[PDB]
Amino acid sequence: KGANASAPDQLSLALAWNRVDIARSQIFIYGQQWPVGSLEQAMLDALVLDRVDFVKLLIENGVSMHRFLTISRLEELYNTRHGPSNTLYHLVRDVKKGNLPPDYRISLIDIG
Amino acid sequence: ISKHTQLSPTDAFGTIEFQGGGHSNKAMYVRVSFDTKPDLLLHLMTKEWQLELPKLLISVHGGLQNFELQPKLKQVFGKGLIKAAMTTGAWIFTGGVNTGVIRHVGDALKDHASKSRGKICTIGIAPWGIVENQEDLIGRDVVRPYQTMSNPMSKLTVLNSMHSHFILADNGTTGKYGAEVKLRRQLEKHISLQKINTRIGQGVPVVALIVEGGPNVISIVLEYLRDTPPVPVVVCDGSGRASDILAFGHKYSEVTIQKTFTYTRTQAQHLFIILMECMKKKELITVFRMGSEGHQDIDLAILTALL
Amino acid sequence: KSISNQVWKFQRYQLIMTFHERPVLPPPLIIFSHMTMIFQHVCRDYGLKLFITDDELKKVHDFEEQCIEEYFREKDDRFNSSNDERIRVTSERVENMSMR
C-alpha cells in the first residue's frame, strides 16, 4: 500500500517475495485494471523463476497458455540463468561435438 | 431504429471452449431470434443437446451490477444451491453474462466442480448484444475457442464460464439488454406445463431465487406471484438491496415514511404501489436468514418452499 | 520366480515382434524368400500401430482427459480420508479451538 505502486509492480514484488497468498488476497482483486501485456510478462517472469503457484494463479486469473507461448518466448525460456542448476549446457556441448563458444544462445533446433 | 431488423438464418451455434481459468469446461450454445416458439427451444434442448426433462426448475434473478457478498453467507448460499440442484435433476436458469449474481453462481459451481463428481445443468439465457467478443462465436457447427480474459474498457461483458448450455437471443440491437426477458419468461411458462414422469397430472415445479436486485426485481417477483399457477420465491437477507427490502417488508405484516432509502428516486417514487400489490399474497414468499430464523440451509429452504 | 515372470512378460513383446519381420518360409525353404527380396531390391496398417480418423482421435482424447481427471479426483479423495490426515486436521482444529 505504501509503495505507491501499480498492479504490475505489486505483482512483481509478490513474485520476488515468493508469497502467493498476498497476491491472492490483496493484489488479484476486483477492478485492478492490468495494462495490456502485463499478465503475460508476469507469466514469463514466474515461468523463468520456477514459481509454480504463481503460474497456477495466473492461469486461474485469465492468461491462456496457447496465446502466451510463442517461438521467441520459448527460446528465451531455454536460455535463463534464474532457477535451479541444470545440465542442458553439457548436453548441447555433447550434441554439438564440442567447440562451443561461450555465451551462445541455444536455438530450438539444437533442442530438437 | 424503428424496429427495422433483417430476418436471417442463424449463423452462430456449436460448442465453445473457455480458454482461461484452470478448467476444461465445454458449453453448447445457439443464436435464436428475440421471438421464437418455446416448442422449438424445448426440442433443441431435448433432442439435440441430449437433456432429460427436469424434476425441478430454479430461476435465479438478481442485480446486473457487480456486487459482493460477505463470507460465511455466500458459502451457505452457493453450497445450498449446488446441493439442491445436484440431489435432483434441475435446470439452473440464469442470466448468463458474467456480472452480478451470475458471477456468484459461477464461483459456486467452481467450488463444487473441484470437490465432487457429476455436472450441474446450468442454462444461461443471455442477450446476444452484450458479449464482448461477437467474433470467435460466428463460427458455425464447429468448436470455437473463447477467451475469458476481461477487458476493463470494452463497454461490454463476457460469457460466464462453468455453464453447460447457452441460449443467445438477439433483436438486432447491440450493447443493451431487453432481448431475453420475454423469451426466458415464456420458456419458463411453457416448461412449467410439461408433464413430469409421474402420471398424477402435475407439471414440473418451478421456483424463483432472489439475491440483491433493483427496481425491476420487485416487478418480476410481482409477475411471478400473480401467474395462473403461483410460483413461490426465495429471498436472502444479507444482500442489502431490494431483496433486503422484501425481507424488511415480510416483517411488519398487515412506517410508510421509511421509503426514503435513496436507492432509486429517493423521494416520491412509485414502488410502494407494487410492494403493496405484493405482500398481499404473502403465502409464497420465503425469507432465508443466516441463523436468525429457521431453515439454516438453502437447499432445505428451496425444497420446503416448493411443497 | 517373480523376477523371471516379470522379465518373461516383458520379453513377450520382443518375441512377438521378431516373428512379424521374419520371412514366411522356414529356414530350409528360406532361400526362396531371399530370392524374392532380390526381385524387390530393384523395385504397417496393423502389427504395430492403428491409424484412426480425426473424430476417433478426439473421442480418445476426451476419454483420456476424463480418465486423468477421475484419477486425480480419486487420489485426492483417498488422501483426504486417511486416518493420519484426519488425526492431523483434528489436532490442529482442537489446538485452535482451545486457544479461542
UniProtKB/Swiss-Prot annotation, chain A:
This is Transient receptor potential cation channel subfamily M member 3. The gene is Trpm3. Homotetramer. Interacts with TRPM1; the interaction results in the formation of a heteromultimeric cation channel complex that are functionally different from the homomeric channels. It comes from Mus musculus. Belongs to the transient receptor (TC 1.A.4) family. LTrpC subfamily. TRPM3 sub-subfamily. It comes from the Eukaryota. Constitutively active, non-selective divalent cation-conducting channel that is permeable to Ca(2+), Mn(2+), and Mg(2+), with a high permeability for Ca(2+). However, can be enhanced by increasing temperature and by ligands, including the endogenous neurosteroid pregnenolone sulfate and sphingosine-1 and suppressed by intracellular Mg(2+). Implicated in a variety of cellular processes, including insulin/peptide secretion, vascular constriction and dilation, noxious heat sensing, inflammatory and spontaneous pain sensitivity. The lineage of its organism: Eukaryota, Metazoa, Chordata, Craniata, Vertebrata. It is found in: Cell membrane. Disruption phenotype: Trpm3-deficient mice exhibit clear deficits in their avoidance to noxious heat. Trpm3-deficient mice display reduced hypersensitivity to thermal, but not to mechanical, stimuli in carrageen-induced inflammatory pain. In the chronic constriction injury (CCI) model of neuropathic pain, intraperitoneal injection of isosakuranetin or primidone do not reduced heat sensitivity in Trpm3-deficient mice.
